[PDB]
Amino acid sequence: GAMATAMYLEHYLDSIENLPCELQRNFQLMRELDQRTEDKKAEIDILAAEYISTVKTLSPDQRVERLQKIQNAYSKCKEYSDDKVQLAMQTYEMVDKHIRRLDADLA
């Protein structure tokens, strides 16, 4: 999990350049994936606000068109959030499988 991952990163301070590539990639991917999510959450807040401020003057066709953008964003945001959970699992399993070799078996 997260404690083990922290202890793992904190142990590789001695050779951060020699930290596994598979992990360097998964940590960089989660950072990116979180930025995409927060950007979608923000887009959703803006789109929602904009809908609320103008809904009286929007015709049925143009309300639906605005609702597509928010739906599409709201689903892509859920898609990222779900992808983050599955990636965070794999990474914690990758770390626990690493520790079992490094520290439990002792190489």
Add this chain to the structure above:
Amino acid sequence: GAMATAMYLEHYLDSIENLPCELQRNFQLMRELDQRTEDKKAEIDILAAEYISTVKTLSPDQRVERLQKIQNAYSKCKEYSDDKVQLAMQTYEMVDKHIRRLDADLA
């Protein structure tokens, strides 16, 4: 008003994973139709750009062939845009009825 709009829009967005199939169909038809439109808009942008960059070297007959090809895309793009408006108005009625059931059960 605005509070109610925010309320109905949340309830709506918290029900995207499970909408009536009539809506799932119509939103996917719009996703398709929108993709055709954006593809035409892009084709039009390219054809227009191409015309502008080469018009000096094009003969009158060639200039017309290029412009005629732009009219065909520009009209097909309008044809899609018009179909989207009709499909969206039909979907607003679906969205409205769904929200009414949704909120009636939640109440």
